[PDB]
Amino acid sequence: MIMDKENTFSYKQAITGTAVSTNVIDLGVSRDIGKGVPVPIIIQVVEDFADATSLTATLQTSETENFSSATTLATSGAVPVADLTAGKQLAVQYMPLGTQRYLRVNYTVSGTATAGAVTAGVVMSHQQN
Amino acid sequence: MIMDKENTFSYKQAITGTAVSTNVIDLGVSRDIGKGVPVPIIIQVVEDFADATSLTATLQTSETENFSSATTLATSGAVPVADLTAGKQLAVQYMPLGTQRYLRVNYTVSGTATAGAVTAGVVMSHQQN
Amino acid sequence: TLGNTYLTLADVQKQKDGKGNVTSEIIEMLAETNPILEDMVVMECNDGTGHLTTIRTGLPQATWRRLYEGVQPAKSTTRQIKDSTGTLEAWSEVDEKLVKLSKDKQQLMLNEAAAFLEGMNQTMASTLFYGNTATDAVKFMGLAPRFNAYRAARNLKPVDTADQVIDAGGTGSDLTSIWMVVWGDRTAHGLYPEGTSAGLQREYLGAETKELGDGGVYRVVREKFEWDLGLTVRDFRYVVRIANIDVSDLQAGTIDIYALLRKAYYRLENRVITGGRAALYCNADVTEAMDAAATPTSSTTASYVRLTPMQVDGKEVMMYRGIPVRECDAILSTETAVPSVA
Amino acid sequence: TLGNTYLTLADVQKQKDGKGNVTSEIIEMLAETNPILEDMVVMECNDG
């Protein structure tokens, strides 16, 4: 993979607590980029989770820097910690449709965590097996 | 949309009342699809709907021909009644990862409508606009 | 329990004449004029997975650089939208012995070929003008479903698909629309899928065998007609639509057809500057209204045209503003009430 | 945050056809016509 810096939501972000993503990719124009030729994305969990219980991994999109009202484009559900190992993908392969203005990832966690990290972001080409 | 029989979940299937896809795909062996080359699918509503509260078109897979081991590859979610309109792509643009021997489409509707139809399957080139 | 599978004795007989030969003249009262099938451009889809188009949806915002000050670079923010094809195909087995028996082989086969060709042309035009995959799955996308929403309070030039539809009245069952499609390469064209031959195809397969399910066997001859295309309006800037035309009011003249037409050709905003071949499609009823407005009888209230005594007949409307107005038997006068985009 | 400043990878993916080559024919859909800059007369200030 040749995943790069700019269009990347989080780089090895712990989000051990109930945090959110840091690099909110913002686009001035509502391109809704998923249309036509696809764009691969990952929300692959990069390092294991110790004492969490659920890792709802929404892909909230909104129309303001601060996500006053956000819209969900991909939610992984209440994934139990038994699967939050390295390489555990948490959404669809390619870019979804409906990216209105802004894009930030939520990390609602049931309870806190003592370990856990992710590398959500856009990738030039997926890695499989 | 260049649909095709022998690779179609359901052709013009009516949705009214809880039911599954009329046709269940069978890929010979339990090998994978979503990986590698993208495979577009459209579980899309064709004809409008009625008093039914919601709809839950999920892409269930199972190793057995009859689906006793349910496995959600991708879910439409509880789409509200208002958005059950023609042309609504209810699930992911591309085929999710982890295809088993067989795949089905499960329609779980909150209540029963007097109208509603879906044509779901894999297309040669998903047509935008 | 049925006999309409193929051509039979009765059909060829009724296709004959009193002389005793297959006629070279069948009056096609179901024939139609379908000009859009002749004014369209067809180019191969050699882009893979259906033809793709690259809209530009933003441009940099340069800065006045006072000396010794830095300028932060920006980028061209593009966007993509792809299109797909859709195939039509018809077949005909005519019991090779039967066509052998009828004296005029070529004339009979030509009659059937013309019948199939005209029917498929009608279907092509109808779905080119109204085919909406969002309700029929397999078909391609026509110009109507891509525009079925109008900007109520139009904004000047934020050109969106809802910014190219002018509405006036409608809201009944007499609604119809008028079209303005620029037929050019980077305007709109017909995609035949890669490898697929261009345009309405025809394959005289010749003699076959037609093995039955009970051991029966007899020769047949099969002629196959195939056609697939997609219209792929690459820049909706080159297309504008006027919808909700109340046919009742249109003939009664309550609605001003020419005011709407002038609101077009300016929302069109193209071929007034640059572009390629243009056209204007509307059924017979609309052109009748335009000719009425050109040479008015006791037409409602006002027409602002004076005529001479000899200038009371009126020609056909023909080229409007230099755009050849073509009449097409596909724009139905029973359209759907195109709604406001709100 | 951001992602709007430099030419990111997503845009490059968007600017190519399915064959894997960069698109020669890009629909502008935002170009404007302004002949003020065309018919205007301009000459060097050539003074203090």
Three-state SS for A31-53 is CCCCCCCCCEEECCEEECCCCCC
Query: Among residues C223, C216, C220, which one has the least CA distance to residue C97?
Result: C220
Structure determination method: cryo-EM
Segment 182-201 of chain C within 8 Å of chain D by CB:
186
By the 8 A CB rule, do C114 and C202 touch? no
Asked if B2 and C141 come within 8 Å (Cβ–Cβ), the reply is no
CB B19 within 8 A of CB B100: no
Enumerate helices (H) and strands (E) in chain C, giving the number of each.
Answer: 8, 13
How far is Cα D12 from Cα D9, in angstroms, rounded to an integer? 5
Checking B4-9 for CB contacts under 8 A at 24+ apart, the result is B4/B121, B4/B122, B4/B124, B7/B121, B7/B122, B8/B119, B8/B120, B8/B121, B8/B122, B9/B43, B9/B103, B9/B104, B9/B105, B9/B120, B9/B121
Q: Nearest residue of D to residue A34 by CA position? A: D14
Among chain A residues, the shortest Cα distance to C79 is held by A31
C164 CB neighbours in chain B (<8 A) are none
What is the residue-wise DSSP string for C155-221? -SS---GGGSEEE-S--SS----B---EEBTTTB-EEEPTTSPSSSEEEEEEE---B-SSS-B---E
- Indicate yes or no: CB of C52 within 8 angstroms of CB of A33: no
The dihedrals phi and psi of C90, each to the nearest 5 degrees, come to -135, 155
Which residues of chain B neighbour A93 with C-beta distances below 8 Å? 34, 38, 92, 94, 96-97
Using CB atoms within 10 Å of the CB of residue A20, give its burial: 0 to 12 exposed, 13 to 18 middle, 19+ buried.
middle
What are the phi and psi torsion angles at A75 (to 5°)? -125, 135
| Total domains, chain C | 1
Tokens of C113: 């070929």
**Which residues, in sequence order, are CB contacts of A97 under 8 Å at separation 6+?**
A32, A34, A35, A73, B89, B93
Token digits of residue A69: 């009202």
A36 Cα to chain B: minimum distance (Å): 7
For residue A84, the Cα-to-chain-centroid distance in whole angstroms is 14
Longest Cα separation, chain C: 97
Resolution in A: 3.5
Which residues, 6+ apart, have CB-to-CB distance to C100 below 8 Å?
Answer: none
Neighbours of B73 (CB within 10 A): 19
In this complex, do D1 and A25 lie within 8 Å of one another by their Cβ atoms? yes
Nearest CA in chain A to B127: A36
Q: Is the dihedral of CA A66, A71, A74, A78 positive or negative?
A: positive
> What's the angle, vertex CA C170, arms to CA C167 and CA C176, rounded to 5?
85
Chain A residue closest in CA terms to B77 = A75
| Chain A nearest C-alpha distance from D21 (Å) | 12
CB A94 within 8 A of CB B93: yes
D-chain CB neighbours of C74 within 8 Å are 4-5
Q: To which H or E segment does residue C294 belong?
A: helix C284-294
Contact C22, C111 (CB under 8 A): yes
Q: CB–CB of B126/B87 below 8 Å?
A: no
Q: What is the DSSP letter of C290?
A: H
Cβ-contact D33, C273 below 8 angstroms: yes
Give the number of other CB atoms < 10 A from CB of residue C30: 9
Which residue of A58, A93, A126 is the best one to mutate when testing the B interface, meaning the one whose CB has the most B CBs within 10 A?
A93
Task: Spell out which residues of chain A touch residue C79, defining contact as CB-CB under 8 Å.
Answer: 29, 31-33, 35
Supply the DSSP string of C237-274, one letter for each residue: GG--EEE---HHHHHHT-S-HHHHHHHTTTSS-SSSSS
Chain D residues in contact with C235 by the CB 8 A cut-off are 27-29
B2/C134 CB distance under 8 A: no
